[PDB]
Amino acid sequence: KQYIISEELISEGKWVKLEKTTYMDPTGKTRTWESVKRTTRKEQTADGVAVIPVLQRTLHYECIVLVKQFRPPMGGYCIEFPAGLIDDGETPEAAALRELEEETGYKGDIAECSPAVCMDPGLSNCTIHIVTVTINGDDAENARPKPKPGDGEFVEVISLPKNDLLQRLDALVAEEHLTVDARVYSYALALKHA
């Protein structure tokens, strides 16, 4: 029923643009919307990937590996799933494993990969694949993992037990002035609601 009529540029940057979107509502009335888009998207299925990294070790509870970084748009520190943009020609799966190794040092194995999902659809067209990855923490390659961050990336790794994720995240927030990512919190809520 509803569809895009046109997209007028309002302002471009090196990395992000703002657009005035004209669209047809279900009554036949024309309406407008201010939309944000990244400038970097190619023939990728999505802008980025987020990795759900499940650290598995014998005689240990499973952990979910997360990353803490300063995020300039937020003006503060955020706790997130390891994540980044998909390179031109890279598969979501390869980007997931690469970004996980870069940001955390862990070498994972693909478990599953989502279709493209929207980050904030009332505001942007940004999409990711959410890729679930198991990390064999008993393999020697994952013994003392060293991050290989790229230029301008500064990451601290935080691994929290899956069986208590939400309480552990609430404790971090109580002690240390930082924001939890909405996908991380949604995941933690569902672990409790199950």
Binding site for Cl ion (CB under 5 A): 193
Nearer to a second copy (CB atom), residue 107 or residue 162: 162
**Cβ-closest residue to Mg ion?**
84
Query: H/E element holding 7?
Result: strand 3-12
Nearer to Cl ion (CB atom), residue 95 or residue 131: 131
Q: Which residues in the 140-169 window bind a second copy by CB under 8 A?
A: 152, 154, 162
C-alpha span between 153 and 2 (Å, rounded) = 41
Determine whether the annotation assigns residue 191 to a binding site: no
Q: Which residues in the 90-129 window bind a second copy by CB under 8 A?
A: 114-128
As measured in angstroms, the least distance from the Cβ of 24 to a second copy is 9
Q: Which residues in the 15-34 window bind a second copy by CB under 8 A?
A: 15-18, 20-21, 23, 25-26, 31, 33-34
- Strand ranges, E, within 15-149: 16-24, 30-38, 48-56, 63-71, 76-80, 83-85, 109-113, 117-118, 127-136
Determine whether the annotation assigns residue 66 to a binding site: no
* Exposure string for 87-103, b = 16+ CB within 10 A, e = fewer: eeebbbbebbbbbbbbb
Determine the interface stretch with Mg ion among 1-9, 39-47, 92-100, 140-148 (rule: CB under 5 A).
92-100
- Measured N-to-C along each axis, helices 182-193 and 165-176 cross at an angle, to the nearest 10 degrees, of 140
Phi and psi torsions of 145, nearest 5°: -70, 135
State the binding partner of 152 from Mg ion, a second copy, Cl ion, none, CB within 5 to 8 A by kind: a second copy
Taken in order 133, 134, 139, 140, the sign of the CA dihedral is positive
The correct pick among 83, 133, 135, 188 for binding Mg ion (CB under 5 A) is 83
Determine whether the annotation assigns residue 120 to a binding site: yes
Q: How far is CA 179 from CA 9, 67, 72, 153, in A?
A: 32, 12, 13, 18
Determine whether the annotation assigns residue 156 to a binding site: no
Q: Which residues in the 39-78 window bind a second copy by CB under 8 A?
A: 50, 52, 54, 70-75, 77-78
Question: Can you give the binding site for Mg ion, defined by CB under 5 A?
Answer: 83-84, 99
